Design a protein around this ligand. Structure first.
Ligand SMILES: [Cl-]
Length: 240
């Protein structure tokens, strides 16, 4: 997250840190949202590669005991079938991870509430992107979970030539684009909490940013629109 601030430890309990280990050490690579005690929603491009992944719930400081963390292995990766590796423009950047065992719910580990099927917000709707991603374009991951205010930018505007053009699809949600606040590498897969009638809900799954930089004026951060995949989500969970 670029242009954000350290979030209060327990403000976003469904946020998880998706980590992989190819070598001798675990490394945070993406974000994710806990949707079931044994299911985490993330972005397909975060898990269509590496071989070993683990999710950390109740996490805050990646480099220090917050004493509330729970580590668990990912048993199965269910990437959306229409997803095309290395192709965020086409969309379908979503995947469900089945955890090795269920995490224990508490104040710091709660399920994320998803918006009802087909729900889309009015332009400039308040949202908050959260994650441990780069705090500066080409920078480094954040040690403490960050949050940045990113109002939605509706499709009519986001798909306009000066913004994202045809690159954005209606199955995606755009937020931010003021040139100061944005998601950045490492936030991918994490949630975009957007107010729906006054209460937050995980409306997006961080998917991509401009190649010219994370914070780019008129280049809002793009996320997979959760409400476009409710049935898909329910189908996966009903397929084991
Ligand atoms: Cl990324």
């Amino acid at each position: 997250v670029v242009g954000g601030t350290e979030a209060q430890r327990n403000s976003w309990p469904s946020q998880i840190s998706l980590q992989y280990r190819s070598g001798s050490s675990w490394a945070h690579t993406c974000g994710g949202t806990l949707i079931r005690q044994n299911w985490v929603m993330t972005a397909a491009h975060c898990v269509d590669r590496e071989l070993t992944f683990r999710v950390v719930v109740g996490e805050h400081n990646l480099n220090q005991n917050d004493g509330t963390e729970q580590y668990v292995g990912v048993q199965k990766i269910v990437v959306h079938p229409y997803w095309n590796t290395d192709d965020v423009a086409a969309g379908y950047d979503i995947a469900l991870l089945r955890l090795a065992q269920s995490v224990t719910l508490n104040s710091y580990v709660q399920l994320g509430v998803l918006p009802r099927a087909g729900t889309i917000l009015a332009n400039n709707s308040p949202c908050y992107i959260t994650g441990w991603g780069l705090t500066r374009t080409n920078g480094q991951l954040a040690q403490t979970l960050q949050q940045a205010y990113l109002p939605t930018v509706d499709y009519a505007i986001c798909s306009s030539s000066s913004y994202w053009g045809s690159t954005v699809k209606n199955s995606m949600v755009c937020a931010g684009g003021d040139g100061v606040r944005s998601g950045c590498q490492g936030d991918s897969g994490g949630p975009l909490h957007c107010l729906v009638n006054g209460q937050y809900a995980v409306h997006g799954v961080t998917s991509f940013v401009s190649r010219l930089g994370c914070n780019v004026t008129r280049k809002p951060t793009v996320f997979t629109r959760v409400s476009a995949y409710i049935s898909w989500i329910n189908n996966v969970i009903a397929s084991n």
